[PDB]
Amino acid sequence: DQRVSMPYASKGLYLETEAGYYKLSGEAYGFVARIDGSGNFQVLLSDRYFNKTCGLCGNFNIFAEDDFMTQEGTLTSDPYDF
C-alpha cells in the first residue's frame, strides 16, 4: 500500500520504462510484462511453462482450441464463463 517512486528493482523484479513504455521484468522467474501509453497489457513468458501456466491467457501449448481449461479443469465452449 506504500506508493514508491519509479524505477524500482526489489526482489529480482526490475520495474523499468522502455521506449517510453513501462516494463516489469522477472527473468529469474521467467516473465516480462509491460504496458503502453493507451493501456494494453502484454506478457512475455519462457518455454519453461509449456503445458503449465493455466489461467486467463490460457496454457502454453501448441494447440489453440483446448486452451480453455478452467480452474477445475474443464474444456468449455464459452470464452466468457471461463
Binding site: 477445475e72 474443464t74 468449455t76 464463463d81
Partner: protein, 59 residues
C-alpha cells in the same frame, strides 16, 4: 386468471419469509434445494450456479 388479493409492485417478487424482494436476492429452488442468491455449485462432471433466481447449469 386475473385474480384478487395481496400482491406487491412488479419490481418486487415474493420471498418465503413474508416480505417480497427484488430479483437480486431471489433464491433458486433446484431439485427442491433452496440455494442462496450466490452459491457456486458443482459435482465432478457438471457445473452449476444460482444467479438471480434461475439455476444456470452447464456440463
Amino acid at each position: 386468471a386475473c385474480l384478487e388479493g395481496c400482491f406487491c409492485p412488479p419490481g418486487l417478487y415474493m420471498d418465503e419469509r413474508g416480505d417480497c424482494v427484488p430479483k437480486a436476492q431471489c433464491p433458486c429452488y433446484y431439485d427442491g434445494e433452496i440455494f442462496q442468491p450466490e452459491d457456486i455449485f458443482s459435482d465432478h462432471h457438471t457445473m452449476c450456479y444460482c444467479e438471480d433466481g434461475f439455476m444456470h447449469c452447464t456440463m
